[PDB]
Amino acid sequence: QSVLTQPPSASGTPGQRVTISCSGSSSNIGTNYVYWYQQFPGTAPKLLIYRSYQRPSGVPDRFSGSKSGSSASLAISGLQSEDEADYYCATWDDSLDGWVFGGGTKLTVLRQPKAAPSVTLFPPSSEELQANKATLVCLISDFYPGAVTVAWKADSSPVKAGVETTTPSKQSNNKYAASSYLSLTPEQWKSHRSYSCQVTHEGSTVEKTVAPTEC
Amino acid sequence: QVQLVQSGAEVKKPGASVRVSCRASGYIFTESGITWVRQAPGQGLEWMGWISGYSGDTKYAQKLQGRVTMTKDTSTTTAYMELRSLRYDDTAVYYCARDVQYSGSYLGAYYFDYWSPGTLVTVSSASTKGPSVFPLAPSGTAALGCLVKDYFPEPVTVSWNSGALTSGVHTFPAVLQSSGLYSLSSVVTVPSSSLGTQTYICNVNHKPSNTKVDKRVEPKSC
Amino acid sequence: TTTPTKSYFANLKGTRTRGKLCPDCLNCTDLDVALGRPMCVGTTPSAKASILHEVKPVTSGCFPIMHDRTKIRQLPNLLRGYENIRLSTQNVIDAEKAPGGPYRLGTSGSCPNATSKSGFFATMAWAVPKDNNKNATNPLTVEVPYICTEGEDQITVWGFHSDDKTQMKNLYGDSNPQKFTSSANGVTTHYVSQIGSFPDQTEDGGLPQSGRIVVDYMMQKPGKTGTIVYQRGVLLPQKVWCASGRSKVIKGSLPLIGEADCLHEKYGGLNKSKPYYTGEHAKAIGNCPIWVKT
Ligand SMILES: *[C@@H]1O[C@H](CO)[C@@H](O[C@@H]2O[C@H](CO)[C@@H](O[C@@H]3O[C@H](CO)[C@@H](O)[C@H](O)[C@@H]3O)[C@H](O)[C@H]2NC(C)=O)[C@H](O)[C@H]1NC(C)=O
Ligand SMILES: *[C@@H]1O[C@H](CO)[C@@H](O[C@@H]2O[C@H](CO)[C@@H](O)[C@H](O)[C@H]2NC(C)=O)[C@H](O)[C@H]1NC(C)=O
Ligand SMILES: *[C@@H]1O[C@H](CO)[C@@H](O[C@@H]2O[C@H](CO)[C@@H](O)[C@H](O)[C@H]2NC(C)=O)[C@H](O)[C@H]1NC(C)=O
């Protein structure tokens, strides 16, 4: 829902050149300067590129800014381990009368082969339903790099309410894992043929389904 | 050296307000401005607004007009952000940043430079509750788990079979509901033939509430 | 032929460009300089192009003013319209000897100097009656001579101080609303002071104050006099503005960064790297590219 559209994930083996795109419209990127910020976990973002093409002092020529129409792009060449971070594009938006940020792209310099996620989906326990509660548990593990998006389905129609997904966490083997929950009333749970947890990772979706009636 | 130093971490009940401070150093405060940007935990950046260090002129993000106020004090070269009527969505890190623009209409022709370390503001009504622990029954590998629902504050601790089961255990970080309470899960991957003969117990320890729960996770029957 | 990217305002290439009235008077707004708030009496250089960056100029210290009672906020934007501006070096009248019996010249803790914790705007003298003269007076009349040179316009700043019932009686000998009139350049404006029930202090020194100040300027053309008629609480003019030539003014922003061929009301600083541009046909100053329909 971000006004500027950034892919959640970008990657490359060390030494390679990777690019991060940022997609906007006439009111923002089309008529305004683009800015790029880099954030390491638990730190302040830092200005990396300014006025679409410029480099602050300290920022190596490895980083490069580009702009064309209503889209901008960040290029990181000679990719190195210390470039692992989150990259945010920002521009003013004349339509919303304020600054806007892209969703942020996580840059992973691969040191491991790309691996698809394992998904396991738990229906609510009998115990939990007796306490008049219901939670669907979708556990995601063994994926690399650590970026997934989660979507839920009631039968075959999307559900957005009562969904809580964790940020992914580096796990026991430098792969990644994450979880997602769908809170329901027993009323809701009983009224559907099936429920689904679909996990998108590297443009590829792994789906798991539960049915209230089966054991 | 361009410095920004903020007030300490804050924790507030929903409905109250917070005033965050931002003291400036190493540049001519009266010829710059401050923007504020906030970051919900594990999320993106949201611009809040700007204020001139020259005139006190302000411009706030449309979503926050009404609720936010910015002021500044030339004497102490300090800026303040006040956020009223806190809801759980206001839990975030609050950055201030040096903004190059200080007069004229604020229209994004300039930009903001250096960001302060960040001040965390936690809006919670929560009042220490132990968790409810539910088993995640197994369906040749098999997955079985423990759901640890609705606790505060962090952290809970999970072991399996009092520590004698370690191979295959993953305990996932907590999720923070919009209710201010946490939930986590823990899964062991086990031999599928091990079901039926072998027992599995998750041990949940939540020290802040002195809650200790051994939950038997057993196969489902129909 | 593209629509320029909006950018910051800049210095105009072949032309002195005025942002603040007094660069070097930091801790000061334009309106602070126009009033001569202490710590804001510095060099006000000439420029032939000026940027109008405050539609509603703001004070940031000294004694609390009721701005909306006069056309006072607009003073620095008037000033910035002239090429040359200067606060006079000599006082335009002697305040202590003015009509209305001997005065002590008042000062305030809201107006700290560096020699004093207490002072007052340099444009005005807070005319407080000595203790034996404090009582009601009939309207007093003072003439304000020209005192500027060449074909300078002279802008004369003056006002009146008011307070609540009891305070008025200590300072002056009269708790009645006082009356005031200025006349200069054929323009005449009447005022009557208010007693108590003042709006909240704003844009001031931040010390709590019982009273309020009202401030106006009158325009005196070369050779021409001005007249103030007044009773108790008057701020008599002292240092006045002298102003000549013309500056082009453009709505824009600050700070002025680097140098540009042209200043555009929407796109900001604009180099003439290309001969034409499209988009918003706003107002432009300097050596500018030619606007064209998309
Ligand atoms: C309009 O065009 C002028 C002229 O090109 C631009 O001003 C110039 O900006 C450049 C930098 O882009 C300045 O060069 C600097 O030189 C110093 C000293 O060697 C060096 O250390 C810096 O790295 C930089 O290269 C140059 O001084 C300056 N020229 C003038 C006459 O001041 C201006 O930026 C353009 N404005 C717009 C709105 O595009
Ligand atoms: C701008 O304001 C500052 C703050 O009052 C002034 O700097 C102070 O100078 C005094 C001496 O007169 C010192 O005692 C203070 O320690 C200074 N302040 C700080 C924060 O260190 C400064 O003089 C003002 N500038 C102008 C032009 O008036
Ligand atoms: C700082 O402010 C004080 C107070 O106005 C100034 O001292 C006055 O100087 C004038 C002469 O210019 C005298 O007539 C007054 O009697 C002085 N006031 C006092 C309290 O004695 C002083 O000149 C100002 N100094 C600076 C550095 O601007």
C7 vs A51: CB contact, 8 Å cut-off? Answer: yes
E-strand spans in A24-133?
35-39, 46-49, 63-68, 71-76, 85-93, 98-101, 105-109, 118-122
Q: Tell whether B149 and B86 lie within a shared domain.
A: no
User: Domain range for residue A193?
Assistant: 112-212
Q: Tell whether A16 and A103 lie within a shared domain.
A: yes
CA nearest A91: which of C5, C71, C45, C12? C5
DSSP at A193: S
CA distance linking residue C154 with residue B66, whole number of Å: 44
Ligand 1 centroid to Cα of residue A171, in Å, is: 50
Ligand 3 binding residues, C-beta < 6 A:
C 38, 113-116, 119
Q: Within 13 Å of residue C143, how many CA atoms lie on the same side as its CB?
A: 5
Q: What are phi and psi of C74, to 5 degrees?
A: -75, -5
Residues comprising chain A, all counted: 215
For residue A133, which residues of chain B lie inside 8 Å, CB to CB?
149
**Chain B interface, mutation test: which of A52, A94, A166, A167, most B Cβ atoms within 10 Å?**
A166
Residue A9, both tokens: 């994930």
CA nearest C256: which of C272, C266, C269, C273? C269
CA distance linking residue B60 with residue B68, whole number of Å: 8
CA distance linking residue C203 with residue C75, whole number of Å: 16
Residues 6+ apart with CB under 8 A from C216: C70, C71, C72, C157, C158, C159, C182, C189, C191
Q: Cβ(B119)–Cβ(B6) under 8 Å?
A: yes
Ligand 2 binding residues, C-beta < 6 A:
B 75; C 26-27, 39, 114
Q: Tell whether B90 and B53 lie within a shared domain.
A: yes
CA nearest C99: which of C132, C144, C131? C144
Residue A34 identity? V
Q: Tell whether B118 and B54 lie within a shared domain.
A: yes
Strand pairing category for A163-165 and C262-264: unpaired
Q: Tell whether B107 and B140 lie within a shared domain.
A: no
CA nearest B110: which of B100, B119, B98, B121? B100
Which CATH number belongs to the domain containing residue A133 in this structure? 2.60.40.10
Of A85, A111, A137, which residue constitutes the final position of a domain? A111
Ligand 3 centroid to Cα of residue B190, in Å, is: 88
For residue A31, which residues of chain C lie inside 8 Å, CB to CB?
3, 5-6
Q: Tell whether A2 and A68 lie within a shared domain.
A: yes
Q: Tell whether A118 and A198 lie within a shared domain.
A: yes
Q: Furthest-apart CA pair in chain B: how many Å? A: 77
Does the CA dihedral B164-B166-B167-B171 come out positive or negative? positive
CA distance linking residue A207 with residue A36, whole number of Å: 35
Q: Tell whether B157 and B134 lie within a shared domain.
A: yes
Q: What angle do CA A135, A106, A151 make, to 5 degrees?
A: 30
CA distance linking residue A57 with residue C58, whole number of Å: 36
Of B125, B157, B189, which residue constitutes the final position of a domain? B125
Of B69, B93, B125, which residue constitutes the final position of a domain? B125
Q: A69 exposed, middle or buried (CB, 10 Å; 0-12, 13-18, 19+)?
A: exposed
Does the CA dihedral B84-B89-B94-B99 come out positive or negative? negative
**Which atom of ligand 1 sits closest to the CA of residue C10?**
38
E-strand spans in B111-181?
112-115, 119-123, 132-136, 141-151, 157-160, 169-171, 175-176
Ligand 3 centroid to Cα of residue C120, in Å, is: 10
Residue C175 identity? S
**Stretch (H or E) spanning A128:** helix A126-130
Q: Tell whether B3 and B104 lie within a shared domain.
A: yes
CA distance linking residue A186 with residue B188, whole number of Å: 27
CA distance linking residue C58 with residue C67, whole number of Å: 9
Q: Tell whether B57 and B143 lie within a shared domain.
A: no
Q: Tell whether A164 and A103 lie within a shared domain.
A: no
CA nearest C237: which of C211, C216, C222? C216
Experimentally, how was this structure solved?
Answer: X-ray
Q: Tell whether B114 and B9 lie within a shared domain.
A: yes
Whether residue B155 is preceded by a cis peptide bond, meaning omega within 30 degrees of 0, is yes
Adjacent-strand bridge partners of B99: B33, B112
Ligand 3 centroid to Cα of residue C115, in Å, is: 7
Q: What are phi and psi of C247, to 5 degrees?
A: -115, 140
CA nearest A103: which of A122, A91, A85, A87? A87
Residue B66, both tokens: 């009404």
DSSP for chain C, written as a single string: --PPPP----EETTS-EESSSSTT-TT--HHHHHHT-TT--------SEEEE--SS----SSS-B-GGGTTGGGHHHHHTTSSEEEE-SS-SS-STTSSSS-EEEE-BTTS--SS-S-B--TTEEEEEEPTTT-S----EEEEE-----TT-EEEEEEEEEE--HHHHHHHSS--SPPEEEEEETTEEEEEE---S-PPPP-SS--S--S-EEEEEEEEE-TT--EEEEE-TTEEEE-S-EEEES--EEEE--BS--SEESEEETTTEEE-TTSSEEES----EEES-PEEE--
Residue B167 identity? S
Q: What are phi and psi of B73, to 5 degrees?
A: -135, 100
Q: Tell whether B178 and B210 lie within a shared domain.
A: yes
- B71 CB within 8 Å of a chain C CB: no
Pocket test for ligand 3, best of C110, C116, C117, C121 (most atoms within 8 A of CB): C116
Q: Tell whether B150 and B82 lie within a shared domain.
A: no
Whole-number Cα distances in Å, A143 to A84, A148, A172, A179, B42: 17, 8, 12, 12, 19
Of A79, A111, A143, which residue constitutes the final position of a domain? A111
**Stretch (H or E) spanning A129:** helix A126-130
Q: What are phi and psi of A127, to 5 degrees?
A: -55, -45
Q: Tell whether A121 and A181 lie within a shared domain.
A: yes
Q: Tell whether A73 and A2 lie within a shared domain.
A: yes
Look at residue B32 and give its three-state secondary structure: coil
Adjacent-strand bridge partners of C289: none
CA distance linking residue C33 with residue C76, whole number of Å: 8
Residues 6+ apart with CB under 8 A from B120: B9, B10, B92, B93, B94
B53-68 burial, b at 16+ Cβ within 10 Å, e below that, comes to bbbbbbbbbeebeebb
DSSP at A36: E
Of A59, A77, A111, which residue constitutes the final position of a domain? A111
CA nearest C92: which of C142, C162, C136? C142
Adjacent-strand bridge partners of A180: A138, A165
CA nearest C173: which of C131, C118, C122? C131
Q: How close, in Å, is residue C6 to chain A by CA atoms?
A: 6
Number of domains in chain B: 2
Residues 6+ apart with CB under 8 A from A170: A146, A176
**Chain B interface, mutation test: which of A36, A57, A179, most B Cβ atoms within 10 Å?**
A179
CA distance linking residue C34 with residue B219, whole number of Å: 84
Measured distance between the N- and C-terminal CA atoms of chain A, rounded to whole angstroms: 38
Whole-number Cα distances in Å, B111 to A193, B119, C8, C270: 53, 21, 9, 18
Alpha-carbon radius of gyration of chain A: 20
User: Cα–chain-centroid distance for residue C108?
Assistant: 19
**Stretch (H or E) spanning A19:** strand A18-23
Residue B104, both tokens: 């004229």
CA nearest C51: which of C288, C248, C281, C292? C248
B55 vs C54: CB contact, 8 Å cut-off? Answer: yes
Q: Tell whether A83 and A163 lie within a shared domain.
A: no
CA distance linking residue C8 with residue C259, whole number of Å: 11
Q: Within 13 Å of residue C66, how many CA atoms lie on the same side as its CB?
A: 21
E-strand spans in chain B?
3-6, 10-12, 18-25, 33-39, 45-52, 58-60, 68-73, 78-83, 92-99, 112-115, 119-123, 132-136, 141-151, 157-160, 169-171, 175-176, 182-191, 201-206, 211-216
Look at residue A28 and give its three-state secondary structure: helix
Q: Tell whether B220 and B150 lie within a shared domain.
A: yes
Q: Cβ(A144)–Cβ(A177) under 8 Å?
A: no
CA distance linking residue C56 with residue C203, whole number of Å: 12
Q: Cβ(A108)–Cβ(A84) under 8 Å?
A: yes
Whether residue C255 is preceded by a cis peptide bond, meaning omega within 30 degrees of 0, is yes
Whole-number Cα distances in Å, C86 to C22, C37, C82, C153, C218: 10, 14, 10, 11, 16
Residue B70, both tokens: 């910015």
Whether residue A145 is preceded by a cis peptide bond, meaning omega within 30 degrees of 0, is yes
Q: Tell whether A79 and A147 lie within a shared domain.
A: no
Residue C217, both tokens: 């300027």
Q: Tell whether A106 and A120 lie within a shared domain.
A: no
Alpha-carbon radius of gyration of chain C: 22
User: Cα–chain-centroid distance for residue C183?
Assistant: 18
Residue A155, both tokens: 């039968």
Q: Cβ(B2)–Cβ(B27) under 8 Å?
A: yes
User: Domain range for residue B64?
Assistant: 1-125
Q: Tell whether A17 and A104 lie within a shared domain.
A: yes
DSSP at A186: H
Measured distance between the N- and C-terminal CA atoms of chain B, rounded to whole angstroms: 70
CA distance linking residue C78 with residue A125, whole number of Å: 77
CA nearest B170: which of A208, A166, A111, A107? A166
Whole-number Cα distances in Å, C201 to C142, C198, C248: 30, 8, 35
Which CATH number belongs to the domain containing residue B32 in this structure? 2.60.40.10
Residue C127, both tokens: 């005319």
Residue B214 identity? D
Number of domains in chain A: 2
Q: Tell whether A134 and A185 lie within a shared domain.
A: yes
CA distance linking residue C246 with residue B20, whole number of Å: 45
Q: Which domains does chain C have, with CATH numbers?
A: 1-15+257-294 (2.10.77.10), 16-256 (3.90.209.20)
**Stretch (H or E) spanning A212:** none
CA distance linking residue C186 with residue A189, whole number of Å: 84
Q: Tell whether A44 and A117 lie within a shared domain.
A: no
Look at residue B79 and give its three-state secondary structure: strand
CA distance linking residue C288 with residue C250, whole number of Å: 14
Q: Cβ(A151)–Cβ(A200) under 8 Å?
A: yes
CA distance linking residue C280 with residue C70, whole number of Å: 35
CB atoms closer than 10 angstroms to residue C188: 11
Q: Cβ(B143)–Cβ(A120) under 8 Å?
A: yes
Site of tokens 């009631």: A154
Residue B83 identity? L
Q: Tell whether B215 and B141 lie within a shared domain.
A: yes
Q: Cβ(C61)–Cβ(C37) under 8 Å?
A: yes
Alpha-carbon radius of gyration of chain B: 24
Look at residue B114 and give its three-state secondary structure: strand
Residue A153, both tokens: 């389905």
Residue C13, both tokens: 């290439």
